[PDB]
Symmetry: none
């Protein structure tokens, strides 16, 4: 029978794969999704291509390609701040709404798991998972 190591590894992998598949139905790649999410979380101040590249640990050309694609779909816009030198990036309403969709996808995946079990059995499983987690924390 499978080890807990294996089960948790494969669940980790498959949740990422399922999420990527769901996002692709909205024509968003994994790195496009991370870009939109990063923008969403940091919108309150000026963010440049360089800021994004540092945070994502990707090259300038990769990020320039990511951003051109998103801008072409009007999920983001870019403008001049350091004038000329720096262009800042913001999300449009559609960009915001897609980030919300991402949250919906994660919530619906969670609901799918919860629906596998009765309320009573969910209580048992979460209690037991919590004991397993605590044993690893101490």
């Amino acid at each position: 029978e499978f080890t807990y190591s294996y089960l948790f590894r494969m669940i980790s992998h498959e949740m990422k794969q399922k999420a990527d598949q769901k996002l692709e139905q909205f024509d968003i790649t994994n790195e496009q999704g991370h870009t939109l999410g990063y923008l969403y979380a940091h919108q309150q101040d000026g963010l440049t291509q360089n800021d994004i590249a540092k945070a994502l640990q990707r090259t300038g050309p990769t990020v320039s390609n990511l951003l051109r694609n998103l801008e072409r779909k009007k999920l983001i816009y870019r403008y001049v701040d350091q004038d000329t030198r720096r262009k800042n990036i913001g999300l449009t309403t559609s960009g915001i709404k897609l980030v919300e969709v991402f949250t919906s996808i994660f919530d619906e995946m969670e609901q799918t798991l919860v629906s596998q079990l009765s309320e009573e059995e969910n209580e048992q499983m979460k209690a037991n998972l919590t004991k397993m987690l605590s044993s690893l924390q101490h």
Copy 2:
């Protein structure tokens, strides 16, 4: 309460942390542990630095640095491949002994987790995780 997504993420993370803490008793990093295991698994054929990089899903100086460190420790050796003049990497006897140790440690971690739950609870947990995994597939 926490979500399953969060519990699973945290469990995976803490398992990695505990394993890494154990590996560090032998002065072996997470990536080095994976590297040694991958070499062990594929040792019967020639394996290159590029093969290691692809297995770790890493690029850059961390890959060359971790390999040079293993080599200085004589846990691995490198040799010119006759078929491709890209060097191949092999485990020394010591390297294999370390992989064996690590396997025992990982096995111990599994048993320690199992020991947290009753027999009935463990069977239930694995059946439910399997049910969940299958649905994500």
